[PDB]
Symmetry: D2
Subunit: 305 residues, 4 copies
C-alpha cells in the first residue's frame, strides 16, 4: 500500500484557484481537496478544474471538501484571509481556521501564503501547537527565485549554477545577500571589479524585485500567478522529499542573531518540512539590515502574543 | 523561429490568461506574446505570469504586444470576442464576432504572420470557418478547439468506468461544439473491444450508465457556469493540449474543428471530427464508418452550422 | 516500502544490465538491487551504473546483494537462466531453466518477498507458469514479458504506416512469445477505423505491405542475432515499460504473459494477451472477440505451450 | 521548418552503444546515425536499438551510416580508438583519419570527444579539423565533478542543485579538487568543516574515491562504459538544448589559468554554440600549483606530436 500524496487547500480565491491549477498542470500531488466558506465558489472551481482533467499530465483527484477532510492531508495550504488593521482581521480568521483543521485530526504540514506571511506563519505555529519545523510560510521564495533568474541572464549562465538569496521579512525590509551571491563558484563582487558588469546595474535588479508585486497590483489589482507558482514549488519540495534550499518563512532561535520569530532564510525543505537552516556568514551591512527586519516583525508580534 | 516556438494569444480574459498559465506550467512553448487593447489588465497579467517564471519547468519568455508581434509566431490563438447575452440568438452573437474577427484576422495577416490559427471563441466552428475565409490560408492551417474537451472528458470517464488507461480507450464526440454533438458509440472500444460487446456480456456494465456519461458531458459547462459564473480552466487545458500537438509535431488524433468537403456526407463546413494534428496543422482526417443513427445526427449537426453560415457567407 | 519503489534484478547479463541502465535513464524506480553469483562482473556493473548516477533525472540507489535483499522489493525481475544451445530442443532448455528457477524462486520467497515477479527468461510463458507454481503467489502477481515487444513494434510500424500517433493505434500480437504468435487483424484499427476498411478504401494501403509488417516483426530478433550475436536492448526496454506500468499504477494494457483459465477457450496456461497492468499486477484481461482464423491460431499457440508444460507439471 | 537535432556517433563499442542507448532513453536528440569500421556490428547495434523504439519516451530516428552522413550533423561524438605511451600514438593516427573523413563530408558542427586520453585527443581534433576551438569539446572531468557534487549533497544533506564543487585539470591522476570554492547553499565547505564536528579527512576521502572510481570498475569488469555514456549524453544535452550549463569539459585555454595553448578540464558554459565562456575561479596557492603542474604534464606530451 503505497503513500498517496494529499493536499488540502483553504481559500479558493485567485491565489488558491491558481495554486490548484498549477498543481494540476505540473502533476505535483495525487489528491487535492478544496475548502472555502463560500461553498458555491469552491464547488464551481473544483468542477472547472476537473473539466479538463483528461488533459493533465498525471492523474490527480480534485474534490470539494470541508475542514474534516484535512484529517489525512499531507499538506494544508492556507490562502484564505482578508485583502495593523488587516493583521487583526487575519489573525482571527486564522485562529478559527487552524482550530477547525486541528480538530479534524490533521497531523501534517501547514503551508501559509496569506500576507503578512511571516506574521501569520508565526501565528499558525502558535494556534496549531505543531513543531516549528512543520509550519512553513512562503517567505521570500518568490523574490529570491526572480533575483536568481535575472542574474543567470545578466551573467549568462543557467540558473542552476547561480546563487543568490533574498532574506528577511517578506516586505520592504527584505534584503539581498550580496556577500554570498556567486556564479558558477565565482562571487559577484569579483565579477563586478574584473569587468565594466557595473554596480547599480546589479543594484537595479534588486530594486525591481522588491517592487515587482506593487507594480502588478497597480495594473490589475491583485497578484496571483507568481504566488501560486512559488506555493506549488514549495509543495513540490515537500511531497517529493527534495531537500531543496528555499528561503521560506522559518522559525529562528539564535541562527542569525534572532530568536522567537518567523522570517525568510534559506532552509532545507523535505517531506518532514524544515530539515535544517542554511547559516550564511553575513557581512556588516547585511547583519544589521537583517536584525532591523527581525525587529520590525517581533514588534508587530508582541501586542498579540 | 528555427530553434524556438512562439505563440501569440489574442484576448487576455479568463480563457486566454488561463491558457497562458497552462502553457507556462506545462512547458509547451518557448515564447508567448499577449495581445489585448485592455492594456492595464493585460500588461498586469503578463507581469504576473513573468513574476514566477523561475519556477516553470522550462524558460518561457512572456511579453505584451500587438499584431505586429505575430510576424514570427507559429500559432495565433484567438480567444477574443463577445460572449452571448441572455435573450440574444447565436446568429446575433455571430454578427458581432464576425466583425471583431474580420479586424483581428486582417491585422494578423498584414503583420507577415505565416503560421497556424487556433480558434477558441464561441461559436467556435462558425468562427473557425470565418477565420479560414478571412485569412486566405489553406484550410489545414486553421483549427478550432471543436469538441476536443467533450471528447477527452467522454474518453477519460469511460477509462474511469471499464477500468483501463485513457490511452487504451477509444471514444469520440463529434459534430458541432454544442447541443447537437453526438457520441460515436459504434466505434467506441476498450483495448479494441467494442463497447456494445462489453455491455452485452457483463451486467455490471449498463447502457443507461453509459448514456448518463453522455448526458453529463454535454451539460458540464452549463453546470460549472451555474455555480461559478463562467468556465475557463477546461477550455484552457484543451487549447494547451492542441497547441502541444502542433508545436511538438505529435500527430495526435483530436476532434478539432476541421473543414469537410464531402467526408461524412457534409460539405463546406468546419465541424468537430477526429483529425491528425501535427506541426503543419491538420495532417489527415479520420473517417469513421458511422451507423445509420449517427449519420443522421451528424448531418443534422452539420446542418445547424450551415444555417448560421448561410446568411453570412456565399 | 512506503514512499520508495524498489526493484530486485536477478541475473546481470546483457539483458539485465541494459534493463538496469534503462530504469536509471528513465527514472522509473527509486532503488535497484542487482543479484548474481558472478560477483566481479555484477559488482563492476553496479559500480559502473553508480558512477554516472548524478546525471540521471531522478536519484537512484543501486546496489549489489543477494536473495535476502528482496525482502522489501516491489518487483523481482528474473533474467537469469541458460539460453537455448544449437541443436538443443526447447524441452531440453526448459528442463535446465526449471531447475534454476526452482532454486531462485524458493530463495526469493524465503526472504520475505511479497511483491510481483516479472519474468524475462526464455521460453518466457513457460517460465512464468513455473514461477507461479513455485512461488504459491496469486496468478495476478506473476507476470512475463509475453509478446509486449513484438506488439509495440507491430503498433509503432502501423502508426508509421497509416500516419498517426502510436497512442491512437490499436494492434496486438498475441499467443506464445515465439513463432506461433499471431496478429489480431480483426481488431486492428486507426483512430477507431478498422484496418480492413482502410485497406479496401485506399489503394496506397495494401495487404501484403501489412502482412510483411508482420513477418518482419516475427523475424526481428533472429536478424539482430545474425549481425551482432545477441539481442538485448529491445528486451530491456520492454521490461522497463512493464515495470513502469506496475510501479506507477498506470493500468496500461500490455500483451504480457498472463494466466488464462477459460478465456479465449484456453485453460491452465500463461500466454500473451492484452491485460491491464497496475500496481497490484494484472488488474484485468481484455477478451477480444477473435475471428475463426484467429481463434484457431490462438488455440494452436496455447497448445504448443501446453505440450511443453505437460511433461513437467501435472 | 523547425530545426532537426542530429547526432553522429563514431565508434559503436561499449561506450558508444551505451551512449546511444542513453540518448534514446532520455529523448535527447531527434536523429542519431551510427558509424563504425566494423559495419556488421554497427548495423546490429542500430537494429537492436530500434527493436525497442516504440518504448522510447520521445521519437528518435536511429540509423546505420558512414562518414558522409555527418554532413548535416549538429554533433559528431567520437568514441572510437584503441583501448605504453604508444597508446597516444595509435589513437593520434586513428583520429587523423576520422576527422579527415568527417570534415571531407562538409560537417560544420561540434565535435564531442570521449576517447582517452581525452584532453590530448581533444587538442588533436581541434588541430586536425581546423574548426574554432569553441566547437571542439572533450568530456574532460565532467563525470568526476558530477560525482563529487552528488557525493557532497548527501554528506551535507542538501539537493545537488544547491551544492557547488568542481574537479579540474587533466582527466587523470593530476586532476584536482577546487576546495576553495566548494560551497553548500552559499556556505563554503571550509566554514562547515570546523564549525561542526563534518570532518576534514572525511571530505578528503571523497576526493580519493572519485579519482580511483574508474580504476576500480576496470579491475572488476574490464572497462567502464555506463558512467561515461551518461556524461556524454549530459554534454550532448547541454548543447542540443542550448542550456548554458556549466560543465568541466575539456576546453582550450590561452592564459585563463596561467595556462595557454592546451585543452584541459575547467568549468565552461555550454550551449548550442559550444563553449560560450570559461568560468574563472580565484584558485588559492595550492590549487594554482596543482593546476599548472597538470597543464605542464599535458603540454609536455603534446610537443613531440605538434
Amino acid at each position: 500500500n503505497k503513500h498517496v500524496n494529499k493536499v488540502a487547500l483553504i481559500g479558493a480565491g485567485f491565489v488558491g484557484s491558481s495554486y490548484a491549477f498549477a498543481l494540476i498542470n505540473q502533476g505535483i500531488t495525487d489528491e487535492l481537496v478544496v475548502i472555502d466558506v463560500n461553498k458555491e465558489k469552491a464547488m464551481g472551481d473544483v468542477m472547472d478544474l476537473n473539466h479538463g482533467k483528461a488533459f493533465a499530465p498525471q492523474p490527480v483527484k480534485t474534490s470539494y471538501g470541508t475542514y474534516e477532510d484535512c484529517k489525512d492531508a499531507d499538506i494544508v495550504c492556507i490562502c484564505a484571509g482578508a485583502n495593523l488593521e488587516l493583521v487583526e482581521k487575519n489573525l482571527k480568521i486564522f485562529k478559527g481556521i487552524v482550530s477547525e483543521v486541528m480538530a479534524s485530526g490533521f497531523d501534517g504540514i501547514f503551508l501559509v501564503a496569506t500576507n503578512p506571511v511571516d506574521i501569520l506563519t508565526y501565528a499558525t505555529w502558535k494556534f496549531s501547537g505543531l513543531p516549528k519545523e512543520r509550519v512553513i510560510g512562503s517567505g521570500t521564495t518568490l523574490d529570491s527565485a526572480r533575483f536568481r533568474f535575472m542574474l543567470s541572464e545578466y551573467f549568462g549562465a543557467a540558473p542552476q549554477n547561480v546563487c543568490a538569496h533574498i532574506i528577511g521579512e517578506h516586505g520592504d525590509t527584505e534584503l539581498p545577500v550580496w556577500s554570498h551571491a556567486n556564479v558558477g563558484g565565482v562571487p559577484v563582487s569579483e565579477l563586478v571589479e574584473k569587468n565594466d558588469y557595473k554596480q547599480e546595474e546589479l543594484d537595479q535588479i534588486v530594486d525591481d524585485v522588491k517592487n515587482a508585486a506593487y507594480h502588478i497590483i497597480e495594473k490589475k489589482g491583485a497578484t496571483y500567478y507568481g504566488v501560486a507558482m512559488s506555493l506549488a514549488r514549495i509543495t513540490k519540495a515537500i511531497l517529493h522529499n527534495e531537500n531543496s534550499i528555499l528561503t521560506v518563512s522559518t522559525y529562528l532561535d539564535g541562527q542569525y542573531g534572532a530568536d522567537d520569530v518567523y522570517i525568510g532564510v534559506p532552509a532545507v525543505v523535505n517531506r518532514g518540512g524544515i530539515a535544517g537552516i542554511t547559516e550564511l556568514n553575513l557581512n556588516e551591512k547585511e547583519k544589521e539590515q537583517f536584525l532591523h527586519s527581525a525587529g520590525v516583525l517581533k514588534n508587530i508580534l508582541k501586542p498579540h502574543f
